[PDB]
């Protein structure tokens, strides 16, 4: 399954989504490295990742090593674990840092980990024909560091263009935050797109914000930006509706 | 104050199986990856296999490549060589290694064991 | 990718410069095994150098020419020197040079 991302074809009878261009996950000369079991593939910036082989509603992991070449001699930047959530219109990528590159020392790796959130792309659901009025409800994952099992639940009021949801089961209680009502503003592709605030006993500890995705705006997804007392942690947001 | 410790080398028949073990202790066995390497008696060294941090992704050398599996477990720290089908020219000294990064095969490798000795013939 | 450490043995003094040669046919390291010992990491790409190994060690080079230097040789610096490329799969190591005693 995760081999099959990496070395088979694109086929159509695969399920979407069948497509996911790697924009911020690898930035212009650089070269990111995927590997699953025995296979192994290179991406540029703009490449396609075939997310039709992975499994729909699950989080699937590459180990990664992120290289660019400076003068004569390939940097290796970045080195850990990515991370691929895909539905039927939308998919996300998120990379857990293990090492990154000595800034002050060329050729030296520094141990640190991170968890980030990279591409969040799919069939963008424009603004202007959302559907008109009704409320749907849209229940799936939000996942962070070493932690895939956190619940994302979101319901869209169409006819107040409103939205709110909440997250539970993450094993970090910081984290089980309230997604506070937004509004589904439009972004400046005229993309549908809920910017709004995290809550935790009604009081900011962040901000979220998640585009709507699918013709019939089956899915949302984005990433919450959730203040703790030991900084700023990253989660991965997806949900569809029934 | 990184330490590895290999175990589970001795004399094996052509066509036997061993399985050899690497425990260490001083790092964040969990963060990276770990290496394989060989040295056959008098002759220099050759790497065997790699694995990644997660576990996730293998890599080999096509002279053992099926014969010989590679595996981790985290909880315990300790890294695996299963050894199938073992052929002559499998006689060699083998070192358990720590590489830099989490991806397996990229990086140099810092740290080394004390190497465990797997002889085979019959 | 193919590497050859020439020349195969280095007769020097202590004091002496050692100059050890690996070519290719990039990212390069080097390791040092004493006589009934295991290998340990020397250098690094380009010249990083490992915990607990003094600056007498430096390498350079790049294209397919690489050096490892020795600036001052030590009673202790006398064995057996392996290069070997990580940067392309499958890793290749060099089949070795040996730094022994002159006299």
């Known amino acids: 399954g995760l081999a099959d991302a990496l070395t088979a074809p694109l086929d159509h009878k695969d399920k979407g989504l069948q497509s996911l261009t790697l924009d911020q996950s690898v930035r212009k000369n650089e070269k990111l490295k995927l590997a699953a079991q025995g296979a192994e593939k290179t991406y540029g910036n703009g490449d396609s990742l075939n997310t039709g082989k992975l499994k729909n509603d699950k989080v699937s992991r590459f180990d990664f090593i992120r290289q660019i070449e400076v003068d004569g001699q390939l940097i290796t930047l970045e080195s850990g674990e990515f991370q691929v959530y895909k539905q039927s219109h939308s998919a996300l990528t998120a990379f857990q840092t293990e090492q990154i590159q000595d800034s002050e020392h060329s050729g030296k790796m520094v141990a640190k980990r991170q968890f980030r959130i990279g591409d969040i792309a799919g069939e963008h659901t424009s603004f202007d024909k959302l559907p008109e009025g009704g409320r749907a409800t849209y229940r799936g994952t939000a996942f962070g560091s070493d932690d895939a099992g956190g619940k994302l639940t979101y319901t869209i009021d169409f006819a107040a263009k409103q939205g709110n949801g909440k997250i539970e089961h993450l094993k970090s209680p910081e984290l089980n935050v309230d997604l506070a009502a937004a509004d589904i503003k439009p972004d400046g592709k005229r993309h549908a797109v809920i910017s709004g605030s995290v809550l935790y006993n009604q009081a900011e500890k962040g901000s979220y914000s998640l585009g709507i995705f699918g013709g019939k705006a089956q899915e949302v997804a984005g990433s919450a930006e959730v203040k703790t007392v030991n900084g700023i942690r990253h989660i991965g947001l997806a949900a569809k509706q029934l | 104050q990184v330490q590895l410790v290999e175990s589970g080398g001795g004399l094996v028949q052509p066509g036997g199986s061993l399985r050899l073990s690497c425990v260490t202790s001083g790092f964040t066995f969990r963060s990276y990856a770990m290496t394989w390497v060989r040295q056959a008696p008098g002759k220099g060294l050759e790497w065997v296999s790699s694995?990644?941090?997660?576990?996730?992704?293998?890599k080999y050398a096509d002279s053992v490549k099926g014969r010989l599996t590679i595996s981790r477990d985290d909880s315990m720290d300790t890294l695996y060589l299963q050894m199938n089908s073992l052929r002559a020219e499998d006689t060699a000294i083998y070192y358990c290694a720590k590489d830099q990064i989490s991806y397996p095969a990229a990086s140099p490798l810092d740290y080394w064991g004390r190497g465990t000795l797997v002889t085979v013939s019959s | 990718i193919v590497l050859t450490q020439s020349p195969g043995t280095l007769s020097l003094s202590p004091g002496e410069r050692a100059t050890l040669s690996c070519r290719a046919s990039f990212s390069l390291a080097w390791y040092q095994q004493k006589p009934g010992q295991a290998p340990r990491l020397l250098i690094y790409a380009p010249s990083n150098r490992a915990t607990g190994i003094a600056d007498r060690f430096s390498g350079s080079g790049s294209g397919t020419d690489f050096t490892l230097t020795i600036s001052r040789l030590e009673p202790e610096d006398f064995a057996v020197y392996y290069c070997q490329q990580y940067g392309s799969s499958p890793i290749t190591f060099g089949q070795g040079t040996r730094l022994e005693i002159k006299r």
């Open positions: 694995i990644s941090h997660s576990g996730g992704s293998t």
